[PDB]
Amino acid sequence: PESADLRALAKHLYDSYIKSFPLTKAKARAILTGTTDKSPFVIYDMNSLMMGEDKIKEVAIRIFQGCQFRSVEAVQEITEYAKSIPGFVNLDLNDQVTLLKYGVHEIIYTMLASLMNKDGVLISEGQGFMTREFLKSLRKPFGDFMEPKFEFAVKFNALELDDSDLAIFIAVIILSGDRPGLLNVKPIEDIQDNLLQALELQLKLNHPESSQLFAKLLQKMTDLRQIVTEHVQLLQVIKKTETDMSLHPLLQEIYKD
Ligand SMILES: *[C@H](/C=C/CC(=O)CCCCC(=O)O)C/C=C\C/C=C\C/C=C\C/C=C\CC
Numbered sequence: 447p448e449s450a451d452l453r454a455l456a457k458h459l460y461d462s463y464i465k466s467f468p469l470t471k472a473k474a475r476a477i478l479t480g481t482t483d484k485s486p487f488v489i490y491d492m493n494s495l496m497m498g499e500d501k502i503k504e505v506a507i508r509i510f511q512g513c514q515f516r517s518v519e520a521v522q523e524i525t526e527y528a529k530s531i532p533g534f535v536n537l538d539l540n541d542q543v544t545l546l547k548y549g550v551h552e553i554i555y556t557m558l559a560s561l562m563n564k565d566g567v568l569i570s571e572g573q574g575f576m577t578r579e580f581l582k583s584l585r586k587p588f589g590d591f592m593e594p595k596f597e598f599a600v601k602f603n604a605l606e607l608d609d610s611d612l613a614i615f616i617a618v619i620i621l622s623g624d625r626p627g628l629l630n631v632k633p634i635e636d637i638q639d640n641l642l643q644a645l646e647l648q649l650k651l652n653h654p655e656s657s658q659l660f661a662k663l664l665q666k667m668t669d670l671r672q673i674v675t676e677h678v679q680l681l682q683v684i685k686k687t688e689t690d691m692s693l694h695p696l697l698q699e700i701y702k703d
Contacts, residue, residue, distance in 0.1 A: 452644045462530035463613035471560035471609045477572045490577040502570045506588040533637045547700040549620040552670040559599035587683045614645045
């Protein structure tokens with residue numbers, strides 16, 4: 447009855463999530479854990495990187511620019527998903543924009559974990575795999591950035607969350623009343639309240655053996671916030687260090703605050 451409505455909401459969010467994101471954790475996992483057709487080309491070095499373009503400025507700049515484009519693309523996909531969450535589109539427009547700008551990076555860092563393994567990260571829609579060591583190898587400050595996302599992913603991946611779990615979790619992240627500058631907090635919190643209940647039910651049904659997964663997943667939010675803070679502090683270095691490097695408008699607007 448009450449639980450049925452929550453199950454329906456969970457089903458809804460899963461459906462929109464599959465439609466919203468071309469690459470899912472199930473696809474990512476099947477490519478990473480091996481499948482002769484799904485196997486990715488691996489870039490661990492400059493020669494492999496050079497080879498990679500044929501199969502799929504500066505090496506550090508070109509790679510960093512590739513990420514930028516990817517992040518812009520993710521923002522667009524996350525923005526469609528946000529539109530799907532019941533009640534989100536009904537909120538004041540300014541708030542929707544505010545939720546989107548604060549929410550989107552946390553979601554992005556969360557989704558990236560599904561592509562990550564301790565050794566590496568999937569690229570080009572799973573077509574390629576880029577090694578963690580190579581990314582670290584890159585000259586400062588570009589090389590440094592990845593290290594926090596890998597550390598998060600290995601821990602976050604330990605939860606063994608399903609794609610349906612993730613979808614509900616990403617909705618909870620987007621619908622956060624705390625965000626700075628929100629005109630109305632109450633309509634947002636009610637939706638979040640509904641979503642948190644759906645997550646709780648989903649986690650217990652989906653991982654009945656797993657104990658206090660809900661609380662552990664909620665605690666995970668702190669690590670996302672920290673990741674974002676480091677990233678922003680790093681973006682500031684890049685702008686000074688390279689006057690020639692250019693940041694995408696969509697990305698720039700969200701960062702500015
Ligand atoms: C890019 C690393 C990006 C850093 C990040 O996690 C998001 C924040 C940076 C952008 C910003 O918000 O300012 C490397 C990771 C993935 C992309 C790598 C190469 C590009 C090719 C494909 C994109 C990867 C997956 C999509 C299929």
